Structures are given as structure tokens and as C-alpha cells.
């Protein structure tokens, strides 16, 4: 009623001839709003145990300092996470269009991510299927190498090479985010789509839809109660269907977000809390492990993979 008519009591008591139409629109938007606070629990709140981060950020030569939280900052965000968050109303409010806050704030989401990182490093995949079990990081990698068909002695003989390649690969992540035109386009598009969807909603109040005027009060008096009223039906129908369209588009868009949230939750389980054997599911190459990071309205995964090189041609035979 604030959107369609405003402070005009003679209009608000006319909208009653429809009655249930406003209820349906209210219900649809409420359902979406509730859903959005579930999508973030399915993805991040996968642990009932919130683990403290390790005091050290350099295990086995592998240094995770760029991944783990940095307590020197008031936001306690990792160097990568702190970048993601920097790369991504009265006119609306006064017309009855408001925005609601999330149940879980960024500060709370960060704690879930920290718990997952702490478990991944100190325990491995075991905490995702029972109690956390401490293991040396070099041994955790040995298991992950066997899992891709590479004998574990390869890791130990080349531990320094592997740690060095890892450190380099992680260091280059920020350079791929801070200097790429659309690194986070997937998150920005969500923001831009809802922002313009709402702005194109309020601008329709300037339309006449066949009425002599867009202004409700100016033609409620400058005409007869029988005649002028005929144009109140016209302005209401116009404004009511404009709002109906907004709600319908949000229901469709919400379904797309749900699908994405379901995928993110699946990858949290299969990539981060384990080791995947599914091709190209957790990045290209042979999956070793993954690390979660928080982002505005979404999640970012860092996928660590093994890629073979320097193929030499040998002569073979089926049997001896």
C-alpha cells in the first residue's frame, strides 16, 4: 500500500477491492528473504566445532600466511580475503522499498572459514568425518600424492621443490584478482542485477498507463468522484502489475542463486573436507586439496592440483 498509493487514505481504502494481491506479493518476498539466510549456512556452517587458528603459519616449508587470518588488522582477514572484499537508498526507502540485513555478519562467516582452514591444515580430511586427528603436514601431502597414483617417496625426495612451487602459486593469486577486469564478475553481477531491478521499479511510478496524470492527488480533486475514480483503477492496475513483475523476476533469480549455493556447499564437502576423484570438479589436473576464502555474497575456493610435465617417449610392451 505505501508503494501503490502512498499517504492517500482514499486510495488505500480502495485497494481493498483486490485484497489478497498484496498478501501474495508480501509472502513471495518473505520466502526469498528467509531462503537467503539458509544458503549461507549450507555452505559455511558445515562444522559444529569452531576451531582456533594455529599459532604458526609455516608448516613443512609450506607457508599458509597469505591464506590464514591476519590479526594485525581490525577485521582479522587474510591478505587474499581482504582483497576480495575490496573488489566488490532514501529514494528507495521513502517509497516503501527496504533492504533487510543478513543473520550472519561477515565477522561470523569469517569464523567458519577460519575453523575450516584450521582443520584442513592441522588434521586433514579426518575432521570432516569424525573427530579431528592431528597429523604432520608433509604426511598429509604424502597421502594426497598416493591418492593420485604417485608413490609417496616422490614427495619426500622433492619436498623442498614442492613446497617452493606451492609458495609461488599462492603468491601469484592476488596478482590474478587485483589486475583482472572481471575476476569477481560473478559476484558483481548479482549486485548489479538486484540494484537495477529495484531502481527500474521506482521509476515506474512516473508512468501514467493511460491516466491523465501520474500524480494521485492532483487528479483526485481536479475531477468528479465518479470520473476521477475511474483513473484510480488505472493507476493501481499499472503500479500493481509493475510490482508483480518485480516479485516474479526475484523468484526466478532466487532459484538460480539456490543452485549456485548448492554447488558451493557440495564443493566445500568434496574439495575442502576431502580429496576429489572427479575430473575437473576441483580444478584442472589431479586434485590434491582446497582452501576456502570468504567473499561478498559468495565463496571463493583455492584449488591445489598436480600437473605432470616433461613427457619422454619410451618403447612399451603388454607383457614380458
Amino acid at each position: 500500500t505505501m508503494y501503490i498509493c502512498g499517504d492517500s487514505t482514499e486510495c488505500s481504502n480502495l485497494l481493498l477491492q483486490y485484497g489478497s494481491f498484496c498478501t501474495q506479493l508480501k509472502r513471495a518476498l518473505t520466502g526469498i528473504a528467509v531462503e537467503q539466510d539458509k544458503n549461507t549456512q549450507e555452505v559455511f556452517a558445515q562444522v559444529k566445532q569452531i576451531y582456533k587458528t594455529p599459532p604458526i603459519k609455516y608448516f613443512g616449508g609450506f607457508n599458509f600466511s597469505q591464506i590464514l587470518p591476519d590479526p594485525s588488522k581490525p577485521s582479522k582477514r587474510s591478505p587474499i580475503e581482504d582483497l576480495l572484499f575490496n573488489k566488490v537508498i532514501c529514494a528507495q526507502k521513502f517509497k516503501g522499498l527496504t533492504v533487510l540485513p543478513p543473520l550472519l555478519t561477515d565477522e561470523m562467516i569469517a569464523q567458519y572459514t577460519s575453523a575450516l582452514l584450521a582443520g584442513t591444515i592441522c588434521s586433514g580430511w579426518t575432521f570432516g568425518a569424525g573427530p579431528a586427528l592431528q597429523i604432520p603436514f608433509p604426511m598429509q601431502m604424502a597421502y594426497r600424492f598416493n591418492g593420485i597414483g604417485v608413490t609417496q617417496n616422490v614427495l619426500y625426495e622433492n619436498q623442498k621443490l614442492i613446497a617452493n612451487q606451492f609458495n609461488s602459486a599462492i603468491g601469484k593469486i592476488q596478482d590474478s584478482l587485483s589486475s583482472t577486469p572481471s575476476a569477481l564478475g560473478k559476484l558483481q553481477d548479482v549486485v548489479n542485477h538486484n540494484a537495477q531491478a529495484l531502481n527500474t521499479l521506482v521509476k515506474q511510478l512516473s508512468s501514467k498507463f493511460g491516466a491523465i496524470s501520474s500524480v494521485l492527488n492532483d487528479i483526485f480533486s481536479r475531477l468528479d468522484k465518479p470520473e476521477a475514480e475511474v483513473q484510480i483503477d488505472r493507476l493501481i492496475t499499472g503500479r500493481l502489475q509493475s510490482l508483480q513483475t518485480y516479485v516474479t523476476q526475484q523468484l526466478i533469480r532466487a532459484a538460480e542463486i539456490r543452485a549456485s549455493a548448492n554447488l558451493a556447499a557440495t564443493k566445500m564437502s568434496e574439495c575442502v573436507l576431502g580429496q576429489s576423484k572427479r575430473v575437473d570438479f576441483c580444478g584442472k589436473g589431479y586434485h590434491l586439496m582446497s582452501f576456502p576464502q570468504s567473499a561478498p555474497h559468495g565463496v571463493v575456493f583455492l584449488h591445489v592440483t598436480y600437473v605432470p610435465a616433461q613427457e619422454k617417449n619410451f618403447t612399451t610392451a603388454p607383457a614380458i
Partner: protein, 165 residues
């Protein structure tokens, strides 16, 4: 104002109107300022205090106590008062004891009916506090096990309907 009809609160304006301009508009082409035809002063027009109202309540099977949340407004425009992000919350007593979220309000705040009993507000917990040791010479190996069974429920179909137009 000289033919410009409307309603709301008239306040001091800092809009730099040109010498020939009589009124202004917002981004939705709706009047949000007028010039007073006698004093030539600019009046800033906003809606009178408003905002959505939600009622926080336990089931009527238990009690008839309620708390009221005013969205988009703080606790000075509203005329057990707690100020949160969602808006001014009145009737709920805020406590520093955290619990699992019961009736969600927003921005980490939830409400519940507890002890004699009344509605309270608190910051919701995330989970149990714990830690996993990192070491380079020690491994934990399970010496026992348990077999457990869990239940998962999924929808497959819904009611089929038809209409004779």
C-alpha cells in the same frame, strides 16, 4: 506551495537551486523539495517517520508476551530498549549470555523466551569452542569405532492439479 501539493515534513534545505528554479526532484522524478513563494527559502521534503513493524512472539500455547521491532528506525524516532542493526527493538531484554539462534532478528541477534519467563535478546553462538594441535612428529590413530545410522528426507513429487477455465 504555489500549486505544488503534497504531504510530509518540511525541513531546512542545502540544495543549491538556480535563481529560476521553483522545486526539485529525486532520481525517480518525484518532488523532494520546494521553494516557498513568499520567503523564497528552500524546504526539504521527506516522508513523516515510518518503517516496517514486526512482532516477535512465542507460541500463544505458552504465553502472550510480545516484543516489537521497528525496521529502519532507531530508538529516537519511535515515539527494555535495545538498538540493533535491523532497527529499534522494544520489549526484549538483552543479555550477554549467548545461545543457539531461536527466533532470528538479524546481524547476529536472535530472541527467545526464557527465565518468571520473558523475551530476551542475545548474540547467537556459532558452535562449540575447540582446537586441533599442529605438530611435525605426532599422529592420532583411532583405537575403536562406532556404527551409526542417520536419516535423510527428500521431496520427490507434489500435488497434481487442473483447472476448468
Amino acid at each position: 506551495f504555489n500549486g505544488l501539493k503534497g504531504t510530509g515534513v518540511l525541513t531546512e534545505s542545502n540544495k543549491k537551486f538556480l535563481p529560476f528554479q521553483q522545486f526539485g526532484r529525486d532520481i525517480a522524478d518525484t518532488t523532494d523539495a520546494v521553494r516557498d513563494p513568499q520567503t523564497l527559502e528552500i524546504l526539504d521534503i521527506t516522508p513523516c517517520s515510518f518503517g516496517g513493524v514486526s512482532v516477535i512472539t512465542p507460541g500463544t500455547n505458552t504465553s502472550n508476551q510480545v516484543a516489537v521491532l521497528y525496521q529502519g528506525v532507531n530508538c529516537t524516532e519511535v515515539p527494555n530498549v535495545f538498538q540493533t542493526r535491523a532497527g529499534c527493538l522494544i520489549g526484549a531484554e538483552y543479555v550477554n549470555n549467548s545461545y543457539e539462534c531461536d527466533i532470528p532478528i538479524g546481524a547476529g541477534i536472535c530472541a527467545s523466551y526464557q527465565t518468571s519467563q520473558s523475551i530476551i535478546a542475545y548474540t547467537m553462538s556459532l558452535g562449540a569452542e575447540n582446537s586441533v594441535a599442529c605438530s611435525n612428529n605426532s599422529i592420532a590413530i583411532p583405537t575403536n569405532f562406532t556404527i551409526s545410522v542417520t536419516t535423510e528426507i527428500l521431496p520427490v513429487s507434489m500435488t497434481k492439479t487442473s483447472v476448468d477455465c
